[PDB]
Amino acid sequence: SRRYDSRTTIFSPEGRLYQVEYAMEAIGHAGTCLGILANDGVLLAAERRNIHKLLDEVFFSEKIYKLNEDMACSVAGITSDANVLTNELRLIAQRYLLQYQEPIPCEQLVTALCDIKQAYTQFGGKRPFGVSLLYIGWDKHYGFQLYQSDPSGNYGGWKATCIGNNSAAAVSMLKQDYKEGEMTLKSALALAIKVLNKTMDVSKLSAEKVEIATLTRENGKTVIRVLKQKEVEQLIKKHEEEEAKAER
């Protein structure tokens, strides 16, 4: 019925896709989520939105998802949409493993999902998924990697980036502090806390309010860990000590 169809998969007069844009506005308001590549690993750090006192704490994270042995992701935007997509990512990764008997290379996993997102902008008359993702991983072709994908079905690789609230500000701070070819996990962790300290300008930064996951290699095996609150507090403490030095 033509009267009620909002026509979600058509061009506007400038060659634009309005839903896609509109989905990108949803993302910009969601929890800030950054990724940082280092020489010995990759990390994700995310603002938590689940922070009311009466919440119960039952999973090992709020917005960090393990995809397969060698890969994880974080998300900004519509949570239920993110659940459908991360489920689909796990399925694609297992289909590839079944067929080839090796892990899916990171970029291939991202591309496979982005093609699904792409389809939702071109046919079927449905709303797109209101999700942007950051993907971290290791494979044998390009080692440690970080990708970003959005509701247009576009992706790229990054050394450091941010999606969600205050993204532009977070990327400026990264442009200025990030040392191409010279970062370590320990210095990326410092930078991530620096960045979240500034971009959560409402208000004072706490371990209850962020989530950090690291992805490293140990004895020929990928290790993916969500940092415990003791460690997050310790990094916050070190960042606060470090800013005391800032003048003299």
Site for Cl ion in 78-107 (CB under 5 A): 97, 103
Q: Can you give the C-alpha Rg of the chain in angstroms?
A: 19
Number of residues that bind another protein (CB under 8 A): 92
Q: Is 219 in the site for another protein (CB under 8 A)?
A: no
Phi, psi of 65 (to 5 degrees): -120, 130
Out of 32, 68, 167, 222, the residue judged to bind another protein by CB under 8 A: 68
Q: Is 153 in the site for another protein (CB under 8 A)?
A: yes
What part of residues 93-112 is at the interface with another protein (CB under 8 A)?
94-95, 97-102, 105, 107-108, 111
Q: 165 near 213, Cβ under 8 Å?
A: no
Q: What b/e sequence results for 146-183 when a residue is b if at least 16 CB atoms lie within 10 Å of its CB, and e otherwise?
A: bbbbbbbbebeebbbbbbbbbbeebbebbeeebeeeeb
Query: Which of these ranges, 147-155, 187-195, 201-209, 233-241, lies near another protein under the rule CB under 8 A?
Result: 147-155
Give the Cα separation of 11 and 178 in Å (integer): 38
Give the Cα separation of 90 and 233 in Å (integer): 32
Residue 78's CB is within 10 A of a number of other CB atoms, namely 19
What are the DSSP E strand ranges found in 164-248?
210-218, 221-226
Out of 38, 44, 45, 121, the residue judged to bind another protein by CB under 8 A: 121
What part of residues 192-211 is at the interface with another protein (CB under 8 A)?
none
Helix axes 79-100 and 106-122, enclosed angle (nearest 10): 130
Q: For Cl ion, which is the closer residue by CB, 6 or 176?
A: 6
Q: How far is the CB of 244 from another protein (least distance, A)?
A: 29
Q: What b/e sequence results for 206-221 when a residue is b if at least 16 CB atoms lie within 10 Å of its CB, and e otherwise?
A: ebebbbbbbbbeeeee
Q: Is 68 in the site for Cl ion (CB under 5 A)?
A: yes
Q: How far is the CB of 115 from another protein (least distance, A)?
A: 7
Q: 32 touches which of Cl ion, another protein, none (CB within 5 to 8 A by kind)?
A: none
Give the Cα separation of 16 and 25 in Å (integer): 15
Q: How far is the CB of 99 from Cl ion (least distance, A)?
A: 11
Q: For Cl ion, which is the closer residue by CB, 41 or 137?
A: 137
Q: For another protein, which is the closer residue by CB, 28 or 208?
A: 28
Q: Is 161 in the site for Cl ion (CB under 5 A)?
A: no
Which parts of this chain interact with Cl ion (CB under 5 A)? 68-69, 97, 103
